[PDB]
Design a protein around this nucleic acid. Structure first.
Ligand SMILES: [Mg+2]
Ligand SMILES: [Mg+2]
Lengths: 56, 456, 456
RNA sequence: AUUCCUGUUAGAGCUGUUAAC
DNA sequence: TAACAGCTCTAACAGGAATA
């Protein structure tokens, strides 16, 4: 289904429409994504066991 | 009580190639993707010249000619990949030298071969190559050939022929890749061809490979020494090396003397503070002037109390100094059990005590072997059955075995002069040793710092 | 109805110099005090290198000697100041290269130039740099000379040799000061000593001068584009430059292609959000995470609705955004009356409409006249008899024409590459345009960001 | 390309306003 | 999507030097 037909399809009937936003949209809101959270966790843990400066 | 601290196996470091296509195995990555400097087109075409006695001239042509043809390995086939020639593998043409560039060793050298005078032979060879001083732009790498008949002056007490030749030629700024009968004396052609091809490409100015995802803000210093057997006492020649990565894409590798007389290999406060300040200025010059956040120092012997303070007083507070001593001779050795059919994994480091760890720089590596895919490869299986673990003694690092262990493991893979998978020591240590030999042979080098491409 | 809103002349911005002294005349202050960055030792000494054909190297050494010795201004003596000698004025020795720090271009470059192939000529010039690359630590700045015989490849359609060379040597970290026969001829031959000398100091170290009265909490952004004429259509390559004064003393000036193909110079909402994100992330990295409080986005063309929405949504509410558009060609032009002999004082801004203002980046400047002190000076007197103002069409702001106008005026004076007193456009726009030309010539540069000293 | 921007010759890019398709 | 109007920009050249 081409995007334009979907837009017409929605515009045609947007009164009755549930939305199901996943974690992808929050990606732009500036919130760290799943991968960003994973990398923050590794970095947070890696610096503590191996004593390294966090902000360096 | 038979329980030790949990060992951690550092993964095999990756090497950077053309188009930043990473690979652990250097030669295979060179075949598949090509040299690191190919994207910059830095060497362009490679132009090389000869300097040998005419009675062996043809030999040089032959090997150079055979540099331009494919070769299939017969020895160490479990590791070495099929050679494709300089034009194909390095994406760079190999230029046949013209008669103007080609030189002949002056006749009196042969005569002094009978005299057994190493200094005279080296000076005569330099004067033979003096015909190439003016035509420095025409050629990039010189191929000096020393015949087996000169073996009497090859090595003797207090003198090293290759060392003296390179010490004489380095201030003139023209690389040589000395070729002896050995290179044309072995059996596996692909091994020597990989060696000479990589050596020539790196000596021209290109970078065959670089450490993948290497931090540009860390400088890895390495200090080594050499013995000169003086008539009255002993002489210790200490020289340093740096393998930092500048803000650009290429990476640097420069050694220099630590200097008037030393009877012990331990740098005092003044000398160590001076060599580290020179290293700091060297690093600043490349990175526009930015401080190195952390500096790693690999010494073959332990750091003195004054020497540690000398290392500290040379840098600011932001710099993190991890003084490390590398020990090659240890009573420990490891056996891998699951009894593994192959030796203990390379990079497996075992923290023995506070500020003392065992690193297995030597060992089996996964996925590198070509024949029988999916099996470990032991590079030194010829020399011995086991891999001997080196030992790190920490002196200054605040914390973390991973930083030093991974840094050293990755550093043992960027020796272009080496045509095998890795080394026993980081390139800092081996190049500091090589330059220590060079300086010990020739005292009139202490003033200037030199790149790795000259002495490799 | 002929009485417009009262204007106010923003005074000449002060420039931070040696020992934090301020002087609105750049060259006079440099002679009197010295470079701002000379307070610390970022450049230890300006070591140079030469790359030219063997025939024209004498021009390079002659011009270097001319830089060494003082010179007197012959043309435009109204503004220029007598050269005091590089060592005296920049307080740093200028080191002439030795034999090995002085390379020779391949003779194949002449053949390529005769063939009229710009790409291969640039590649050959870059490949000639290997002799210096073996000694990259030795020198700081490389003076590449191009003989007039290569004019056929200097500039033609779909190509520019200067941009290609800059983009090829930018990832190799070596600054390059290209010299055309223009430093040979060039009668006011103390011009050369200041333009070339200030460029050499900036490329070896940095910050010849810094703008004073600069809030550390403002990051200034300038977007500019260029056109690559495709066979079928066109490609609009737009890139963004950023200036800011960080917590450290080193004022920062970077650029980075925001970008695949674009058909119009108006960035899409996703592209602006990504470019703006990269910008404030760079600021945060240079400000230990502190959020910028004022953001100025100067664009040569009007912001669409998408661009303004992207600006609004990329930042938080605490950081007010000053979206301003700069119009170069305008119908309006003014004449000062008390009628004055010299045109209107530089920096006068005249609010025409609630969103559109005239800014006189060109005009008479007070207090920088060498002869007959007190007389006004018009920088573009030779080019134009009257100053053509620019139009600032504010697309987003809370209040205050003075806040943006003074920032633009101060940003028009920190172009170290500019020999003259000021620039018609802020340094953000000019550097974004220069980098846009570079990226248009070499599309494979979008990965990295670069400091000003590489491309100025 | 030490610089500066003054003009010339062209084309695009946006807006529009119509006619459509 | 095809013209047409304006506003503004860059892309190639050429080009002379700070109130005389
Ligand atoms: Mg070798
Ligand atoms: Mg320049």
């Amino acid at each position: 289904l081409t995007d334009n037909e979907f837009y017409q399809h929605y515009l045609q009937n947007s009164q009755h429409m549930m939305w199901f936003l996943g974690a992808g949209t929050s990606r732009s809101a500036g919130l760290p994504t799943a991968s960003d959270i994973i990398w923050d966790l590794k970095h947070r843990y890696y610096c503590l066991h191996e004593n390294q400066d966090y902000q360096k | 009580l038979s329980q030790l601290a949990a060992h951690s196996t550092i993964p095999e470091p990756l090497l950077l190639f053309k188009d930043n296509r990473t690979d652990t195995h250097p030669l295979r990555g060179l075949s598949q993707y090509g040299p690191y400097s190919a994207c910059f087109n830095l060497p362009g075409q490679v132009r090389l010249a000869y300097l040998a006695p005419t009675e062996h001239m043809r030999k040089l042509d032959a090997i150079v000619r055979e540099l331009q043809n494919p070769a299939t390995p017969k020895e160490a086939t479990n590791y070495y990949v099929e050679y494709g020639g300089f034009e194909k593998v390095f994406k760079v043409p190999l230029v046949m030298p013209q008669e103007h560039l080609r030189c002949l060793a002056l006749d009196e050298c042969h005569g002094v071969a009978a005299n057994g005078n190493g200094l005279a032979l080296a000076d005569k060879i330099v004067q033979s190559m003096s015909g190439l001083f003016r035509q420095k732009h025409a050629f990039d790498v010189l191929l000096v050939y020393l015949p087996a008949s000169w073996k009497k002056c090859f090595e003797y007490d207090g003198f090293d022929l290759h060392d003296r030749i390179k010490a004489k030629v380095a201030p003139l700024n023209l690389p040589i890749q000395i070729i002896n009968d050995t290179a044309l004396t072995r059996q596996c052609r692909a091994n020597v061809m990989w060696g000479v091809s990589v050596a020539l490409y790196a000596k021209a100015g290109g970078i065959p490979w670089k450490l993948a995802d290497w931090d540009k803000d860390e400088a890895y210093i390495g200090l080594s020494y050499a013995i000169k057997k003086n008539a009255e006492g002993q002489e210790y020649t200490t020289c340093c090396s740096q393998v930092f990565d500048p803000d650009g894409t290429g990476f640097e590798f420069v050694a220099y003397d630590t200097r008037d007389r030393k009877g012990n290999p331990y740098l005092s406060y003044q000398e160590m503070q001076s060599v580290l300040s020179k290293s700091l200025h060297l690093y600043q010059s490349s990175h526009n002037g930015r401080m190195p956040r952390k500096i790693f120092i690999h010494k073959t012997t332990h750091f003195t109390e004054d020497e540690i303070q000398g290392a500290f007083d040379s840098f600011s507070s932001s710099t993190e100094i991890e003084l490390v001593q590398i020990i090659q001779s240890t009573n420990w050795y490891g056996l891998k059990v699951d009894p593994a059919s192959y030796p203990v994994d390379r990079g497996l480091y075992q923290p023995l005590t506070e500020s003392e760890c065992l690193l297995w720089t030597q060992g089996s590596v996964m996925g590198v072997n070509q024949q029988n895919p999916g099996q470990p490869v032991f590079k030194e299986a010829a020399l011995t059955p086991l891999p001997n673990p080196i030992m790190l003694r920490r002196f200054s690092g605040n914390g973390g075995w991973h930083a030093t262990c991974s840094s050293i493991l990755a550093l043992t893979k960027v020796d272009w002069n080496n045509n095998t998978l890795y080394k026993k020591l980081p390139v800092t240590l081996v190049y500091s040793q090589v330059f220590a030999d060079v300086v010990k042979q020739t005292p009139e080098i202490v003033n200037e710092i030199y790149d790795y491409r000259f002495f490799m």
